């Protein structure tokens, strides 16, 4: 066809324009208020060199099936088959584990970004078919807050991070100083879980123009920072706990934290304040005993302390720190230290843990909200924390504890991942690699030739949302529209819906009309519809019928009182009235049921613990703190093999921001290629030499894609960039069992071996 039609995706709503059934450009939204400059990239991933055309067997699996030497997974030895023969192959291993070991046998889990879409959700879609075979194992948690949604229920009685934030309007109006703590807004809101709106743009945009002072706590001088004119104070990574038990003695030792607030609405502060005097440890916790652990002058930890109480304060935190050992202890101690500045509750006071994801704060509409598709139970034990697949291959049916529980790890025989990247994700690659060997098979349905699909043994090619119709929402938080996401062309190469991959699988099972119920893909997405329509109706909000809604695209919902939202307000106001759901029915700062479980790695009220190895740590073997954020440029590993990768690459490598001290002291220059190392594994970067990091610290984002030099050897080099090659796969403490991702050090060096090719970015042989 020849036209345009709009859609969406996880970067905005977008107008894309057809040529002779060829999408040819991604155009912004015309109401869009800050469009991504990624649009480019999402539409060459319907057709780079990376699109995956076939389905295809692993030459040792398709011969030898469970009896296959199980080390040459990603050798590059594939074998094109026919989709009848790849889908038999898939269903008579499904059926044999299932029969052999029981629900234990099959990990489903899967965990990852996918694409937007209430139909077109393939961990929902795959987690369907697997129940109708006979269930699985699946997994708790996520990558991004394992460790604050465990301890913040403990706290403030609720999961926090993903709830609304105070709106943005209020914030602009009533704010005297915005803290972004380990946070970078103008980067990370560029994406949404639904469609974004890109809403925190126009509230930061109001915040600029009003001229409020802003304070970024971070290693690195951002897009955030340059926009605002912020000051950047700097604290070695993993020392932010140190630098808060700084300033709250400081606040506790000058009479300016507020006691009205601590005995009204907290408990357990006497019990903190021992440890902070040290009188119950024998360790006062000064700005000087802060700031020989952090590496900031003692006064400047005095003054920001002081600068917190002199007006209205918003600490706006971020969740790196938490990604990190001991994460639990991070928002734990943000949460302490807003209670003692007494702010909370108040407009444009107190924290927030959603500025910087998903336009937290752009106010809420009136509208009604959409569902969609269910799983038949997306936005040994029977379920794991996500973060422990590796120790669960590694130990079969050993214990583990977590958040007050003592289980075990089932004994898992396959493993079926779709719309995720584990080998991109996942830390402590090397050690990944060699537990990898425990699984008898390992399925993979993706649209790109990723690290993951180079590793597996079966290979289904799906589709991209813009070879299908589906419906979603726009604003994670602002539930701003429900927007039609039409067809832009028809299905590439052999590549298949996952919904017609899932199905065709439930077929041969004897189970089809279990799992379509007899729906067609305009039936299940007008279901969706309506259903909204009837909430709606009961709210007396206006909708259209279905034809009219799908013929013109979207159906927008107003916004009212969600512009004044002030969170924390009820429960300041009358805290006996309004009770958290805590045990105690106010913030716990100490925590009498994290007392009785028992964990030496995460105490009954925040604490200061050195972690496995840090910048400034006591027996450290590497020199520099390795900052493994999120790109800039890229959604994780997404787009990676798009002509977008050509903004970044340096020589054709992942970049590593370095600073001109850290550089010079090894001979680098600009545009060097570099190797990276330490005693867990080692990678090819390109420098980018820049003073916006700190010395000490070097930025490789997450997301690359692994290259091994030569896949036969143990610990080969990574000839493009995959970060997580250095990484340390623990848990962050007995508590949340989260992933410690940002916990890494490393040393670099120009690279001093013979030329190295890469070829992740190219079609495989026989693709
Ligand atoms: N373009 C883009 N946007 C994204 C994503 C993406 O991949 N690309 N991913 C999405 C997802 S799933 C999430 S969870 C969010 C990511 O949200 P976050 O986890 O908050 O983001 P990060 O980029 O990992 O880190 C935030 C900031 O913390 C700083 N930092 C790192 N270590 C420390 C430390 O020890 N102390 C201090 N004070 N600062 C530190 C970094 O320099 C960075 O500027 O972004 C979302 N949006
Ligand atoms: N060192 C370090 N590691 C990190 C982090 C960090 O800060 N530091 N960040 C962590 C976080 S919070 C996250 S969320 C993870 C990111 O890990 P992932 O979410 O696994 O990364 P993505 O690259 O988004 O992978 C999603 C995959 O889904 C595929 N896909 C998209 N839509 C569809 C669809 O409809 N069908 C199918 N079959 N496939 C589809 C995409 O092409 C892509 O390959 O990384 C984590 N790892
Ligand atoms: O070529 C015909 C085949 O096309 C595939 O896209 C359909 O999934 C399958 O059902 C059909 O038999
Ligand atoms: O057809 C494209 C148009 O569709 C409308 O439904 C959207 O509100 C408008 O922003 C967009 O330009
Ligand atoms: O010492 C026990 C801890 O060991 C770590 O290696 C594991 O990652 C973690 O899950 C466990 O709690
Ligand atoms: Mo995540
Ligand atoms: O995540
Ligand atoms: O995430």
């Given at each position: ?11 905005g709503?977008?107008?894309?324009r057809?040529?002779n059934?060829?999408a ?19 539409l060459?991933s319907?057709?780079?060199?990376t699109?995956i055309?076939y389905?295809?067997v ?8 469970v009896?296959?030497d199980?080390?040459?997974?990603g ?9 009848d023969?790849?889908l038999?192959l898939?269903?008579?291993?499904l059926?044999?584990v ?19 879409g209430?139909?077109?959700?393939c961990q ?7 129940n109708l075979?006979?269930?699985?194992v699946?997994?708790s948690?996520?990558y991004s ?7 913040m229920?403990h ?19 009533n704010?005297?100083?915005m ?7 103008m ?8 469609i974004?709106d890109?809403?925190?743009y126009?509230?930061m945009?109001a915040?600029?123009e009003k ?6 706590i971070?290693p690195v001088?951002?897009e955030?920072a340059?926009y605002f004119?912020?000051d950047?104070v700097?604290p ?15 606040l506790?030792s ?8 601590l005995?009204?609405?907290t ?5 903190f304040?021992?440890?902070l ?25 005095r003054?920001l302390?002081?600068s917190?109480?002199?007006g209205r ?13 001991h ?12 209670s ?8 444009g ?9 998903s336009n ?6 009136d ?5 969609g598709?269910?799983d ?25 504890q977590?958040?007050?529980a003592?289980a ?6 396959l493993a ?5 990247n584990?080998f ?5 690659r ?7 060997e425990?699984?008898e098979?390992?399925?993979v ?16 090619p799906?589709?991209?949302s813009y070879?299908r ?6 604003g ?5 529209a429900?927007?039609?996401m039409?067809?832009?062309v028809?299905?590439l ?10 199905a065709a ?8 009309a ?7 893909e305009m039936?299940?997405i ?8 009837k909430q ?5 909000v206006a909708?259209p019928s279905?034809e009219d ?10 916004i009212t009182?969600?512009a004044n939202?002030?969170?924390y307000?009820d429960?300041r106001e009358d ?6 759901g805590?045990?105690?029915?106010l913030?716990?700062?100490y ?7 028992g964990?030496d790695?995460?105490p ?9 190895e840090?910048?400034?740590g006591?027996?450290?073997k ?8 999120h790109?800039?440029?890229?959604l994780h590993?997404?787009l990676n093999?798009t002509?977008?990768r ?10 590593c921001l370095?600073?001109?001290?850290d550089?010079?002291?090894?001979g ?7 190797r ?6 080692q ?10 990091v ?17 896949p036969?050897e143990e ?12 990484s ?5 403490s007995?508590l949340?069992q ?6 890494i050090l ?6 001093a ?15």
């Amino acid at each position: 066809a020849n036209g345009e039609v709009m859609s969406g995706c996880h970067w905005g709503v977008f107008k894309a324009r057809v040529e002779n059934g060829r999408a040819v450009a991604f155009e912004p939204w015309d109401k869009d208020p800050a469009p991504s400059h990624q649009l480019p990239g999402v539409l060459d991933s319907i057709y780079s060199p990376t699109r995956i055309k076939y389905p295809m067997v692993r030459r040792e699996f398709l011969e030898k099936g469970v009896n296959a030497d199980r080390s040459t997974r990603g050798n590059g030895d594939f074998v094109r088959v026919t989709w009848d023969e790849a889908l038999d192959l898939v269903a008579r291993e499904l059926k044999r584990v299932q029969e052999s070991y029981g629900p234990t046998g099959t990990f489903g889990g899967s965990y990852g970004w996918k694409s937007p879409g209430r139909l077109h959700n393939c961990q929902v879609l795959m987690r369907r078919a697997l129940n109708l075979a006979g269930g699985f194992v699946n997994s708790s948690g996520d990558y991004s807050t394992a460790a604050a949604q465990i301890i913040m229920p403990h706290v403030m009685g609720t999961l926090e991070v993903y709830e609304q934030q105070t709106a943005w309007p209020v914030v602009v109006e009533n704010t005297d100083l915005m803290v972004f703590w380990a946070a970078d807004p103008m980067k990370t809101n560029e994406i949404g879980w639904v469609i974004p709106d890109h809403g925190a743009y126009a509230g930061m945009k109001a915040l600029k123009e009003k001229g409020t002072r802003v304070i970024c706590i971070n290693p690195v001088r951002t897009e955030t920072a340059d926009y605002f004119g912020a000051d950047v104070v700097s604290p070695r990574p993993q020392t932010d706990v140190a630098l808060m038990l700084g300033m709250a003695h400081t606040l506790y030792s000058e009479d300016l934290h507020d006691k009205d607030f601590l005995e009204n609405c907290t408990t357990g502060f006497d019990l903190f304040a021992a440890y902070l005097t040290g009188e119950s440890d024998g360790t006062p916790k000064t700005a000087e005993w802060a700031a020989e652990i952090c590496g900031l002058p003692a006064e400047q930890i005095r003054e920001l302390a002081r600068s917190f109480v002199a007006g209205r304060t918003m600490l706006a935190a971020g969740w790196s720190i938490q990604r990190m050992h001991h994460g639990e202890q991070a928002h734990w101690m943000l949460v302490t230290l807003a209670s003692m500045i007494g702010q909370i509750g108040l407009p444009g006071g107190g924290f927030g843990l959603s500025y910087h994801y998903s336009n937290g704060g752009s106010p809420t509409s009136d509208g009604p909200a959409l569902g969609g598709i269910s799983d038949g139970g997306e936005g040994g034990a029977t379920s794991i924390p996500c973060a422990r697949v590796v120790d669960m291959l590694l130990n079969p049916g050993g214990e583990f504890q977590f958040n007050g529980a003592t289980a075990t790890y089932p004994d898992v025989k396959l493993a079926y991942w779709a719309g995720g990247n584990p080998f991109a994700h996942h830390q402590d690659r090397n050690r990944m690699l060699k537990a990898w060997e425990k699984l008898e098979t390992f399925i993979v349905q993706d649209f790109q030739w990723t690290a993951t699909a180079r590793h597996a043994d079966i290979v289904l090619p799906a589709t991209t949302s813009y070879e299908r119709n589906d419906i979603e929402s726009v604003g994670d938080y602002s539930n701003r529209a429900i927007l039609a996401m039409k067809k832009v062309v028809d299905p590439l190469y052999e590549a298949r819906s996952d919904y017609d991959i899932f199905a065709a699988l439930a077929e041969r099972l004897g189970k089809g009309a279990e799992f379509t119920e007899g729906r067609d893909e305009m039936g299940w997405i007008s279901s969706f519809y309506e259903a909204a329509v009837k909430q709606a109706e009961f709210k007396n909000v206006a909708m259209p019928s279905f034809e009219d809604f799908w013929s013109e695209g979207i159906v927008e919902f107003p916004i009212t009182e969600g512009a004044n939202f002030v969170r924390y307000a009820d429960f300041r106001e009358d805290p006996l009235f309004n009770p958290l759901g805590t045990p105690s029915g106010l913030i716990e700062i100490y925590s009498k049921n994290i007392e009785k479980m028992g964990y030496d790695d995460c105490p009954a009220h925040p604490t200061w613990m050195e972690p496995a190895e840090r910048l400034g740590g006591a027996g450290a073997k590497y020199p520099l703190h390795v900052v493994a954020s999120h790109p800039k440029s890229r959604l994780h590993s997404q787009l990676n093999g798009t002509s977008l990768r050509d903004l970044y690459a340096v020589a054709g490598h992942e970049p590593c921001l370095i600073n001109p001290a850290d550089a010079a002291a090894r001979g680098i220059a600009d545009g060097d290629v570099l190797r990276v190392f330490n005693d867990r594994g080692q990678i090819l970067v390109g420098a980018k030499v820049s003073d916006a990091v700190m010395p000490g610290a070097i930025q490789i984002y997450e997301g690359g894609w692994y290259d091994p030099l030569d896949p036969s050897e143990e610990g080969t080099l990574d000839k493009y960039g995959d970060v997580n090659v250095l990484s340390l796969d623990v848990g962050t403490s007995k508590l949340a069992q989260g992933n410690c991702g940002q916990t890494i050090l490393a040393d670099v060096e120009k690279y001093a071996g013979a030329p190295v090719t890469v070829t992740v970015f190219d079609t495989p042989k026989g693709a």
